[PDB]
Design a protein around this ligand. Structure first.
Ligand SMILES: *[C@@H]1O[C@H](CO)[C@@H](O[C@@H]2O[C@H](CO)[C@@H](O)[C@H](O)[C@H]2NC(C)=O)[C@H](O)[C@H]1NC(C)=O
Lengths: 49, 48
């Protein structure tokens, strides 16, 4: 979670972080690809019958 | 929330993620030490 980890629990956190653009939503789109893949690996090894 | 997280007006079937769950503070509180040390002002105001 980018907002809470970086400077969470601060009213001046989000607005200052907001002007940096689309950084943590870029990272968030990379740690969900890993999450989905780790479920597909088990579907190809054990689920062949 | 999902619509504005995906920055679109149309979404497809499946599980997504959005902003997080949080609890706002109920109030605000501050800290005080114990009693006060005595300064010699009674003697000054009651000096003979
Ligand atoms: C700071 O001083 C003492 C330290 O714990 C506390 O006062 C208690 O309550 C009354 C006065 O408020 C005393 O007669 C008690 O003896 C104190 N309790 C104990 C266990 O000693 C309190 O924390 C603070 N009191 C004030 C007035 O600031």
């Amino acid at each position: 979670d980018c907002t809470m980890y970086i400077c969470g629990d601060s009213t001046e956190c989000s607005n200052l972080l907001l002007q940096y653009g689309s950084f943590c939503t870029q990272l968030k789109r990379a740690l969900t690809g890993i999450a989905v893949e780790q479920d597909k690996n088990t579907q190809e090894v054990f689920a062949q019958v | 929330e999902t619509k504005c997280t995906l920055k679109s007006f149309t979404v497809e079937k499946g599980i997504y993620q959005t902003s997080n769950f949080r609890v706002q503070p109920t109030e605000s509180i501050v800290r005080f030490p114990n009693i006060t040390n005595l300064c010699p002002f009674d003697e000054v105001f009651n000096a003979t």
